[PDB]
């Protein structure tokens, strides 16, 4: 009965493709032939945060747009003050192989993970002074890639065992598991309402999960290689995926199909991180060729370059008020731009 | 100054920067290695003879006021290229090859040759030297006395003795690198051998000295 079900699946995917073709009447480029180009957006380095000793792999901003977190293989998770370039905490880790970090929306907790298959949670506002480990979550069978905080009580992680999970920090138990991917999962971004999220895997596909029922809702497939970074549009109806084939694309949730791709024949190195701006008019993407790029998200033309790093940029993120953008590369440095 | 204390915060920053520097200095006297190979190639044997559970498994040992960290990563059953970029900047790579590769799993020796070729020409390991261990040298003698070597390499032309065949195998493995910035060290090791930590020590010292000479510009 395998052949019959295979034919049924082929018919289903043919119906999907026919519906996608029918639902498209024009392109976002055609409708945006009249808007005013943003011109050359020149940004300058404001601060340089130099405390680390090895390559930086992850970084997350604070909710108040002032405090910052960074992780690296020197075994440290040190959080910064952006305005004064001060160091306010330095958290030593148990495993030096760290590839993700998070900073709680309330500001009390941080998270960390890596090749040790464990997501650790730290308490910053303890009564006795120094920061301590609160929970040590261990349910995955592969390296973690990205973890985001729903709130102070529940967290969501994505691992390289083709699964994603939602945890209850108080009990420490894997409340829900999400399955359906084929290769390693490498990215994750939460909605503004934190009611659903997406994830991009190494099989060149991105899925639209729902945190309540734990069932995938939509599948987007346009890329040709592994996807390394996802980020929602500020209005929560689109996301941009940066893949390893030196291109990034914008997908729309309702239209269920690709809208526009951002590519240039002079670019051959792959993407490592993607983030938007406060209004969605700009797309910032890290690159393997030692620098960053700014894309006019509505016109698909380059609008600036953020040079100053002499190695791969691995993390990138704008503040919650849109005032600044921070990048961090493998040269153990981290910059702030306005 | 115009600081409103607002100045013990700066003092705290200086103290934890001092702690970071002290931690960094004390973490530069330990050598980081990386053990690679295949099953039944004896890569567990070298760990066993060196003195003193998913994720990264280590073999934490020391020798002669130089500290070592041997990372065995054979247990990560996932995509290799997605976490080998974080394993660069290691001092050396230990590769274990079994000399009794005279059977299918193709011939095991050919798989070892292909994997060595893949690992010595990766973009992250173009400048990292490799120390090569040829394991199971006692079995090889009787294996070659019983069976010829032409089963593995058809184009072999020479004596069927231990020395010439061993030299041919070693040359075949050493002819896989093209970068002039790295060197391959080799050693014939039996199943039970007296010293294998000295061979890592006196090779890591040479690697460090060569790196220092290149960095200074005196090379």
């Amino acid at each position, epitope marked *: 009965e395998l052949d019959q079900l295979r034919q049924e699946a082929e018919q289903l995917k043919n119906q999907i493709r026919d519906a996608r073709k029918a639902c498209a009447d024009a392109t976002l480029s055609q409708i945006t032939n009249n808007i005013d180009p943003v011109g050359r957006i020149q940004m300058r380095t404001r601060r340089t945060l130099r405390g680390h000793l090895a390559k930086i792999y992850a970084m997350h901003w604070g909710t108040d747009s002032r*405090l910052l977190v960074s992780a690296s293989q020197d075994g440290k998770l040190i959080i910064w003050d952006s305005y*004064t370039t001060n160091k*306010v905490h330095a958290i030593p880790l148990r495993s030096s192989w760290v590839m993700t970090c998070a900073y709680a929306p309330s500001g009390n907790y941080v998270a960390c993970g890596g090749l040790d298959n464990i997501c650790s949670i730290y308490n910053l506002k303890t009564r006795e002074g*120094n920061v301590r480990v609160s929970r040590e979550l261990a349910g995955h069978t592969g390296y973690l890639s990205c973890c985001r905080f729903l709130d102070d009580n529940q967290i969501v992680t994505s691992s390289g065992d083709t699964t994603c999970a939602l945890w209850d920090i108080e009990t420490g138990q894997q409340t829900t598991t999400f399955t359906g991917h084929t290769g390693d999962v490498m990215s994750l971004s939460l909605a503004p309402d934190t009611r659903l999220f997406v994830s991009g895997a190494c099989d060149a596909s991105a899925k639209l999960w729902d945190v309540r029922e734990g069932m995938c809702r939509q599948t987007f497939t346009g890329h040709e290689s592994d996807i390394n970074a996802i980020c929602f549009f500020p209005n929560g109806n689109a996301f941009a995926t940066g893949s390893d084939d030196a291109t990034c694309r914008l997908f729309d949730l309702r239209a269920d199909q690709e809208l526009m791709t951002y590519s240039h024949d002079n670019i051959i190195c792959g993407i490592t991180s993607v983030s938007f701006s406060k209004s969605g008019r700009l797309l910032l993407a890290g690159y393997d060729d030692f620098n960053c790029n700014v894309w006019d998200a509505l016109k698909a033309d380059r609008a600036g370059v953020l040079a100053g790093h002499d190695n791969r940029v691995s993390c990138l993120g704008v503040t919650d008020d849109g005032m600044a953008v921070a990048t961090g590369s493998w040269d153990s440095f981290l910059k702030i731009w306005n | 100054t115009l600081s*409103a*204390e*607002d100045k013990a*915060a700066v*003092e705290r920053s200086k*103290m934890i920067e001092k702690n970071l520097k002290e931690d960094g200095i004390s973490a530069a006297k330990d050598v980081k290695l990386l053990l690679l190979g295949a099953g039944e190639s004896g890569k567990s044997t070298i760990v066993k003879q060196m003195k003193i559970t998913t994720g990264i498994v280590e073999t934490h040992f020391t020798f002669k006021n130089l500290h070592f960290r041997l990372f065995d990563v054979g247990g990560q059953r996932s995509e290799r290229k997605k976490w080998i970029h974080c394993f660069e900047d290691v001092t050396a790579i230990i590769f274990c090859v079994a000399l009794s590769g005279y059977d299918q799993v193709t011939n095991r020796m050919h798989e070892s040759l292909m994997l060595f070729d893949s690992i010595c020409n990766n973009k992250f390991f173009i400048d990292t030297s490799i120390i090569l261990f040829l394991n199971k040298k006692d079995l090889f003698g009787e294996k070659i006395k019983k069976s010829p070597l032409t089963i593995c390499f058809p184009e072999y032309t020479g004596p069927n003795t231990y020395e010439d065949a061993a030299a041919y195998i070693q040359a075949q493995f050493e002819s896989k690198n093209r970068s002039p910035n790295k060197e391959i060290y080799c050693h014939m090791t039996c199943a039970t051998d007296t010293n294998n930590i000295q061979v890592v020590f006196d090779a890591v010292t040479d690697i460090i000295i060569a790196n220092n000479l290149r960095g200074c510009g005196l090379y």
Partner: single-chain antibody
Amino acid sequence: DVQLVESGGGLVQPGGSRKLSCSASGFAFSSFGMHWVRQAPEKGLEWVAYISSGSGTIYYADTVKGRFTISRDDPKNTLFLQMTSLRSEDTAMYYCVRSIYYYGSSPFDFWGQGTTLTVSSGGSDIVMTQATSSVPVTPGESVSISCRSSKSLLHSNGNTYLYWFLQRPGQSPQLLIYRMSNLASGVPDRFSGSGSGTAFTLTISRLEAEDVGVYYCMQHLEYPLTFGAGTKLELK
């Protein structure tokens, strides 16, 4: 869990010396800043000394400089005060406070319990005045307490360094609101503070029988730290 207990007070003849100790247990002593605060038998609180984490910076009051010495031994997590050539005006009760400092921290959060000390007979400071002295209150009513200064406390950073303390009778002071409207940890939501520059107020809603005592205001803009006379609340 967290405990500050002192010892070393008693009867001292004028011209002698004494050594006060502050032994802490329950927190990371080595990464905190510690103060010494004394209180006269009937007057208010007065600041004495200060030593920072790592013993980097040490400050002294104007009336004890050259006679008192403050030092800490954090491997054995105890704090000391060496006193020399006591006078009849040094008789008071000495307290021990911890003042961790970083971005967003809450200084002066925990206070010690104090040791008595009795001795027999033998300009640029920021003065802060609390015009109110004592007012009667009844449960279920809202009252306001005001504390005014002489220099503006609004630094260019946007911070305003005003601290409010509560001292119930036969007890050590607690921290209510710090710098200048933040609510401390463990203090109810009834208390609230407001002000600007040199005029400040503390708002209490739905007063009960448990929050009766004397309220004090302190400044942390620049050393030496200056307290106030305090306002006493009593049942009508």
